[PDB]
Design an enzyme around this catalytic site. Structure first.
Site, PDB file in Angstrom:
ATOM      1  N   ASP A 243       0.624   9.198  12.127  1.00 51.11           N
ATOM      2  CA  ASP A 243       1.283   9.597  11.491  1.00 51.11           C
ATOM      3  C   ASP A 243       2.448   8.792   9.777  1.00 51.11           C
ATOM      4  O   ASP A 243       3.100   7.694  10.940  1.00 51.11           O
ATOM      5  CB  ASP A 243       3.078  10.065  12.756  1.00 51.11           C
ATOM      6  CG  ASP A 243       4.071  11.131  12.168  1.00 51.11           C
ATOM      7  OD1 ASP A 243       5.038  11.118  10.621  1.00 51.11           O
ATOM      8  OD2 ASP A 243       4.823  11.561  12.433  1.00 51.11           O
TER       9      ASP A 243
ATOM     10  N   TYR B 201       8.745   5.503   8.054  1.00 55.63           N
ATOM     11  CA  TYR B 201      10.558   5.060   7.612  1.00 55.63           C
ATOM     12  C   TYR B 201      10.248   3.594   7.385  1.00 55.63           C
ATOM     13  O   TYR B 201      10.893   2.768   8.075  1.00 55.63           O
ATOM     14  CB  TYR B 201      11.525   5.042   9.159  1.00 55.63           C
ATOM     15  CG  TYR B 201      11.571   6.793  10.113  1.00 55.63           C
ATOM     16  CD1 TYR B 201      12.363   7.396   9.335  1.00 55.63           C
ATOM     17  CD2 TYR B 201      10.566   6.944  10.924  1.00 55.63           C
ATOM     18  CE1 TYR B 201      12.100   8.982   9.717  1.00 55.63           C
ATOM     19  CE2 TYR B 201      10.919   8.332  11.503  1.00 55.63           C
ATOM     20  CZ  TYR B 201      11.807   9.918  10.781  1.00 55.63           C
ATOM     21  OH  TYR B 201      12.272  10.807  11.787  1.00 55.63           O
TER      22      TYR B 201
ATOM     23  N   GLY C 233       5.166   4.629   4.661  1.00 53.54           N
ATOM     24  CA  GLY C 233       4.517   4.910   5.981  1.00 53.54           C
ATOM     25  C   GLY C 233       6.320   5.628   6.632  1.00 53.54           C
ATOM     26  O   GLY C 233       6.834   5.780   6.060  1.00 53.54           O
TER      27      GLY C 233
ATOM     28  N   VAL D  47       0.635  -1.536  -0.149  1.00 53.90           N
ATOM     29  CA  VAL D  47       0.356   0.294  -0.106  1.00 53.90           C
ATOM     30  C   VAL D  47       0.744   1.460  -0.012  1.00 53.90           C
ATOM     31  O   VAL D  47      -0.249   2.257   0.125  1.00 53.90           O
ATOM     32  CB  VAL D  47      -1.340   0.419   1.213  1.00 53.90           C
ATOM     33  CG1 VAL D  47      -2.167  -1.085   0.712  1.00 53.90           C
ATOM     34  CG2 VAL D  47      -0.477  -0.503   2.704  1.00 53.90           C
ATOM     35  N   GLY D  48       2.553   1.101  -0.131  1.00 53.82           N
ATOM     36  CA  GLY D  48       2.770   2.468  -0.138  1.00 53.82           C
ATOM     37  C   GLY D  48       4.033   2.498   1.168  1.00 53.82           C
ATOM     38  O   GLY D  48       4.063   1.637   1.833  1.00 53.82           O
TER      39      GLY D  48
ATOM     40  N   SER E  14       7.994   0.544   4.346  1.00 56.09           N
ATOM     41  CA  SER E  14       6.828   0.544   3.729  1.00 56.09           C
ATOM     42  C   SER E  14       5.895  -0.479   4.391  1.00 56.09           C
ATOM     43  O   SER E  14       5.798  -0.961   5.589  1.00 56.09           O
ATOM     44  CB  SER E  14       7.281  -0.285   2.236  1.00 56.09           C
ATOM     45  OG  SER E  14       8.052  -1.758   2.158  1.00 56.09           O
ATOM     46  N   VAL E  15       4.778  -0.353   4.590  1.00 55.24           N
ATOM     47  CA  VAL E  15       3.838  -0.818   4.786  1.00 55.24           C
ATOM     48  C   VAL E  15       2.588  -1.297   3.618  1.00 55.24           C
ATOM     49  O   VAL E  15       2.680  -2.066   2.593  1.00 55.24           O
ATOM     50  CB  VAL E  15       2.407   0.568   4.702  1.00 55.24           C
ATOM     51  CG1 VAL E  15       1.039  -0.183   5.410  1.00 55.24           C
ATOM     52  CG2 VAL E  15       3.144   1.712   5.506  1.00 55.24           C
TER      53      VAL E  15
HETATM   54  C1  LIG Z   1       1.207  -0.096  10.686  1.00 54.74           C
HETATM   55  C2  LIG Z   1       1.401   1.282  11.254  1.00 54.74           C
HETATM   56  C3  LIG Z   1       2.699   1.124  12.455  1.00 54.74           C
HETATM   57  C4  LIG Z   1       3.107   2.722  12.282  1.00 54.74           C
HETATM   58  C5  LIG Z   1       2.743   3.849  12.196  1.00 54.74           C
HETATM   59  N1  LIG Z   1       3.206   4.546  12.917  1.00 54.74           N
HETATM   60  C6  LIG Z   1       2.981   5.884  13.979  1.00 54.74           C
HETATM   61  O1  LIG Z   1       1.343   5.958  13.389  1.00 54.74           O
HETATM   62  C7  LIG Z   1       2.815   6.445  14.173  1.00 54.74           C
HETATM   63  C8  LIG Z   1       4.451   7.124  13.397  1.00 54.74           C
HETATM   64  C9  LIG Z   1       4.726   7.869  15.158  1.00 54.74           C
HETATM   65  N2  LIG Z   1       4.209   8.533  16.018  1.00 54.74           N
HETATM   66  C10 LIG Z   1       2.973   8.641  15.673  1.00 54.74           C
HETATM   67  N3  LIG Z   1       2.309   9.631  16.566  1.00 54.74           N
HETATM   68  C11 LIG Z   1       0.622   9.253  17.019  1.00 54.74           C
HETATM   69  C12 LIG Z   1       0.023  10.158  17.588  1.00 54.74           C
HETATM   70  O2  LIG Z   1       0.168  11.481  18.324  1.00 54.74           O
HETATM   71  C13 LIG Z   1       1.835  10.878  18.631  1.00 54.74           C
HETATM   72  C14 LIG Z   1       2.695  10.808  17.333  1.00 54.74           C
HETATM   73  C15 LIG Z   1       1.968   7.592  15.219  1.00 54.74           C
HETATM   74  C16 LIG Z   1       1.872   3.717  11.342  1.00 54.74           C
HETATM   75  C17 LIG Z   1       0.709   2.816  10.825  1.00 54.74           C
HETATM   76  N4  LIG Z   1       0.521   2.586   9.559  1.00 54.74           N
HETATM   77  C18 LIG Z   1      -1.338   2.545   9.807  1.00 54.74           C
HETATM   78  N5  LIG Z   1      -1.834   1.773   8.904  1.00 54.74           N
HETATM   79  C19 LIG Z   1      -1.274   2.526   7.650  1.00 54.74           C
HETATM   80  C20 LIG Z   1      -1.935   2.757   6.250  1.00 54.74           C
HETATM   81  C21 LIG Z   1      -1.691   2.929   4.913  1.00 54.74           C
HETATM   82  C22 LIG Z   1      -0.096   3.684   4.894  1.00 54.74           C
HETATM   83  N6  LIG Z   1      -0.721   3.575   3.684  1.00 54.74           N
HETATM   84  C23 LIG Z   1       1.370   4.165   3.189  1.00 54.74           C
HETATM   85  C24 LIG Z   1       0.916   6.201   3.159  1.00 54.74           C
HETATM   86  N7  LIG Z   1      -0.146   6.293   2.207  1.00 54.74           N
HETATM   87  C25 LIG Z   1      -0.331   7.834   2.015  1.00 54.74           C
HETATM   88  C26 LIG Z   1      -1.206   5.502   2.551  1.00 54.74           C
HETATM   89  C27 LIG Z   1      -1.005   4.379   2.688  1.00 54.74           C
HETATM   90  C28 LIG Z   1       0.249   3.933   5.806  1.00 54.74           C
HETATM   91  C29 LIG Z   1       0.082   2.652   7.287  1.00 54.74           C
HETATM   92  C30 LIG Z   1       1.033   2.824   8.200  1.00 54.74           C
HETATM   93  O3  LIG Z   1       1.897   3.627   8.234  1.00 54.74           O
END
Ligand SMILES: Cc1ccc(NC(=O)c2ccnc(N3CCOCC3)c2)cc1-n1cnc2ccc(N3CCN(C)CC3)cc2c1=O
Length: 328
Positions: A157, A31, A29, A26-27, A33-34
């Protein structure tokens, strides 16, 4: 030990427990890939992130530790939480990869005023929580907010230009700051949902400041007293002076309670800006506010941030956190 299986997608090896099925890229995230996957244990969709070269250097190693520590801590309805964390490694010696699993986050963020009310309420409810443990997001913008079809929202994030949403005190570094840097960002997002337009779309730090001062006015004598930087002081006093606009004449035909809240969020003085907890009690949110269902976080130890450690030491600390994880 669960059974693992391997595969190649996008010129990268994924080795994951059999629990997770039908991985689909799916692209990127933060640091890593997801992939989307199916969790056979619950029958729900999940997102799996494989971190990119987590232990290549001291910086990568400490940021890997930082993210895992943070995700393990955050337990709240409007903030992303940790479902699982794993490695295919059977020992510290062969530990080289880290995978983080969460619920599958939805699509990111003119809207109706009732919709603006509910979305901004949920963001503030999440911020009261993170801010209560002295955790600051620092990069709040529409692309870092997930919203499902029920209009439920979570702050995350994924790693819109950031400068468009950045508090002047941390973009230009000109006075002390606090958790309210995130409140400035919220004000910018709320304006955009009311108008359908980016509020301050600057081309650089200088253009960005020029656009901001056009709305809020040049700092007066009372704020200039708190400007720590002499360079910034001279800069501000050398500009042609701009007066503060009446927000009501800018956000024409918006709900007057919304306009009032925007006036309290978009102030330059970091000591005067409304906090998340205060904003929850504003009249704009009368339909949603419940002081018995806006919880705070358990305290969070971030003493690790000040520490100066070798790659193998950050790696062993990260290994510990993988081993000690307990599922929600
Ligand atoms: C799986 C996962 C694991 C870890 C994280 N980490 C964080 O969200 C994070 C990291 C650091 N600080 C955070 N805090 C939030 C609260 O306030 C303080 C800071 C959050 C995120 C994901 N995650 C979840 N679902 C996804 C869905 C689609 C996508 N994709 C890629 C991006 N594109 C744009 C859309 C689809 C990515 C994810 C993706 O990364």
């Amino acid at each position: 030990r669960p059974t693992f299986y391997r595969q190649e997608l996008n010129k990268t090896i994924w080795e994951v427990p059999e629990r997770y099925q039908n991985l689909s890229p799916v692209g990127s995230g933060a640091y890593g890939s997801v992939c989307a996957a199916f969790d056979t244990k619950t029958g729900l969709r999940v997102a799996v992130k494989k971190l990119s070269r987590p232990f290549q250097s001291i910086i990568h190693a400490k940021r890997t530790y930082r993210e895992l520590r943070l995700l393990k801590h955050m337990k709240h309805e409007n903030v992303i939480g940790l479902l699982d964390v794993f490695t295919p490694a059977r020992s510290l010696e062969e530990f080289n990869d880290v995978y983080l699993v969460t619920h599958l986050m939805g699509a990111d963020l003119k809207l109706t005023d009732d919709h603006v009310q509910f979305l901004i309420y949920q963001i503030l409810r999440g911020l009261k929580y993170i801010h209560s443990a002295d955790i600051i997001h620092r990069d709040l913008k529409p692309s870092n907010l997930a919203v499902n079809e029920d209009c439920e929202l979570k702050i995350l994030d994924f790693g819109v230009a950031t400068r468009w949403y950045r508090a002047p005190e941390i973009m230009l570094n000109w006075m002390h700051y606090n958790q309210t840097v995130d409140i400035w960002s919220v004000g910018c997002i709320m304006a955009e949902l009311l108008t359908g337009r980016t509020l301050f779309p600057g081309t650089d730090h200088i253009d960005q400041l020029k656009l901001i001062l056009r709305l809020v006015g040049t700092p007066g004598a009372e704020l200039l007293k708190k400007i720590s930087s002499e360079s910034a002081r001279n800069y501000i006093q050398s500009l042609t002076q701009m007066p503060k606009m009446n927000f009501a004449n800018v956000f024409i035909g918006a709900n007057p309670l919304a306009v009032d809240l925007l006036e309290k969020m978009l102030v330059l003085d970091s000591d005067k800006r409304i906090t998340a907890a205060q904003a929850l009690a504003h009249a704009y949110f009368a339909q949603y506010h419940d002081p018995d269902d806006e919880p705070v976080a358990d305290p969070y130890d971030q003493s690790f941030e000040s520490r100066d450690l070798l790659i193998d030491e950050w790696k062993s600390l990260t290994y510990d956190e993988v081993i000690s994880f307990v599922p929600p």
